[PDB]
């Protein structure tokens, strides 16, 4: 069925299971909609034979330069996407509840790449994209594929983020604290002008765009205090670097960053210290630095977050296409 967004008590249902759910996303989460109040929401969901969800897909429909929207489910749906017949269902659905308005249907789940899989999914006239399509450009994936993510139930027993490291990384994750940085966090309006300021100070001297603060003002009235949470970090007084984590499901996303011009004396160290405290005592099973480029120190992105995770990156199956539109597909979507 499509959720009626006008109906609280099917729009808790509907967020419960979400919310519950060990697919869990904040991607997929309602309140992502109203962060991207520019795009048009449609949900839809599927039940058991006792009327209880068991699988639901946020989708959010983009303009295009073509009459047809672009329907994108951002890393969902929340369900074990493996299960490709369960699949087709959930995407019958969806299909139904676009109503022939968009040229097609895009989710990629954060699922591991497999041959089988991708062949499966092809078999079931899905179109793929992933190890076939450049690795930047307008061309590339929306989400990066590689993502340094970090199993913390490989540490039952971690007790604080350094007990996840060798000594090597100890030292330099205690630098900055033993330089003077000290972090707060919360996510109260305080919190975020310190991490605006951090933000686009950041982008300024890469020369590159920011997103209005409004953005985040919606982000933070979509979710709570034990949702979202905000770390700054200084040094006596002086504001150093910030970033922003958002914990749903089994994950902890470490999202946005910023950091002053100058000396910082590793305040980034100190931010993702404190992130990783907070998935420990919330006994949450991942933390997740985001994507890299690729793996190598050719990739700064991948030497910082390298310092985290040691493990080999999580590969994703990538972006998963319900070609609706072929025509409008092929002029708008290539390798």
């Not at 299909?95 to 040229?103: E, F, N, Q, T």
Request: no cysteine; charged share 30%; proline share 4%.
């Amino acid at each position: 069925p499509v959720l009626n967004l006008n109906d609280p008590q099917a729009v808790e249902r509907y967020e419960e299971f979400m919310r519950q759910s060990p697919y869990g996303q904040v991607t997929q989460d309602l309140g992502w909609a109203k962060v991207k109040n520019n795009w048009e929401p449609v949900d839809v969901y599927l039940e058991d034979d006792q009327g209880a969800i068991i699988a639901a897909m946020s989708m959010l429909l983009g303009d295009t330069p073509t009459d047809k929207k672009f329907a994108y489910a951002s890393k969902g749906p929340v369900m074990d996407v493996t299960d490709v017949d369960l699949l087709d269902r959930l995407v019958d659905e969806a299909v139904k509840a676009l109503d022939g308005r968009a040229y097609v249907l895009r989710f990629d789940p954060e699922v591991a790449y497999s041959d089988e899989f991708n062949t499966t999914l092809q078999d079931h006239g899905y179109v793929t994209r992933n190890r076939n399509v450049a690795d930047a450009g307008m061309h590339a994936t929306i989400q990066p594929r590689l993502n340094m993510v970090l199993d913390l139930t490989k540490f039952p027993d971690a007790k604080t983020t350094l007990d996840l490291y060798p000594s090597k990384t100890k030292s330099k994750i205690k630098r900055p604290f033993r330089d003077g940085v000290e972090v707060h966090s919360g996510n109260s309006a305080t919190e975020l002008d310190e991490f605006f300021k951090t933000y686009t100070t950041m982008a300024e001297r890469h020369g590159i765009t920011h997103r209005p603060i409004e953005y985040f003002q919606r982000m933070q009235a979509a979710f709570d205090a034990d949702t979202m949470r905000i770390f700054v970090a200084e040094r006596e007084g002086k504001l150093l670097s910030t970033g922003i984590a958002l914990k749903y499901g089994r994950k902890i996303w470490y999202m946005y960053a910023g950091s002053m011009d100058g000396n910082t004396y590793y305040a980034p160290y100190a931010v993702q210290s404190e992130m990783i405290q907070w998935a420990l005592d919330t006994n949450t099973d991942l933390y997740d630095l985001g994507g890299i480029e690729s793996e190598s120190t050719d990739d700064s992105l991948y030497v910082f977050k390298h310092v985290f995770v040691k493990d080999a990156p999580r590969e994703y199956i990538g972006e998963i296409d319900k070609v609706l539109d072929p025509e409008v597909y092929a002029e708008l979507v290539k390798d």
